[PDB]
Amino acid sequence: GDTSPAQLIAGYEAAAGAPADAERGRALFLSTQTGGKPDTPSCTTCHGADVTRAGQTRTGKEIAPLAPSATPDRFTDSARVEKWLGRNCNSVIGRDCTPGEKADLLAWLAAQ
Template sequence: MKAHLLILPALLMASPAFAADTSPAELLARYSAEAGTAADPARGRELFLANHSGGKPETPSCTTCHTDDPRAAGKARTGKAIDPLAPSANPERLTDSAKVEKWLGRNCDSVLGRACTPGEKADIVAWLSSL
C-alpha cells in the first residue's frame, strides 16, 4: 500500500471524536452578553437544585436525571445513562453549542415549563464550570 494512503486513516484517528465549536468560557460570555448582566454561579446552583412546579410533574428538578452532583453520571427516566455535566468531570461538556442549546431547550421546558432565559443559561454554565 502506498504511504499517502495510510495518512488519511491516521489523521482521522487523531481527530477528536466530538465537535468542539465553543468552550464553557465562550458560552458564559455569550449568555451573559445576551442577558446584559454577569453570571452568578450561586444562582445557577440554586436553579439546578430547586424543585420547580411549572414543568412536567415527573421532572420537577434538574437533579431528577442529573443527580445533585453534576460531576457524577445521571440517568434519564428511560434508564439511559447520562454523562456528567460538569466540564471538570467530562471535558466534552459545554463544547458543542448545538448540543448545549438542544439540551437546555428540552430540559428547561421539561423542568421549568418554559425556555431558560439567557441569564439562567449563564448562571447554570457558570456553576457547572466552577465545579
C-alpha cells in the same frame, strides 16, 4: 469543538445584560419546580445533586456526568448546549430558560 465554555457564558451574559452568578445557577439547578412536566421536577431528577457523578434518565439509563471535571468535552459545542437547554428547561420549568438563567447555570456547571 466549536466553542469554549467561557465563549458560551459571555454570549449569554451579553444577551442577559449581566454577569453570570454561579450561586444563582446552583440554586436553580437544585430547585424543585412545579411549572413543567410532572415527572421532571428538577434538573437533579436526571443529573443528580452532584454533577461529578453519573445521572439517569426517567427509565434508568446512565447519563454521563455533567461536570467538565468528569466529562471533558462538556459545553464545547454551542448548538448542543442550546438543544438540551431548550428541551430540559421546558421539561423542568415549563418555559425556555432566559439568557440570564443559562449564563448562571453554565457558570456553576462549568466549574464542577
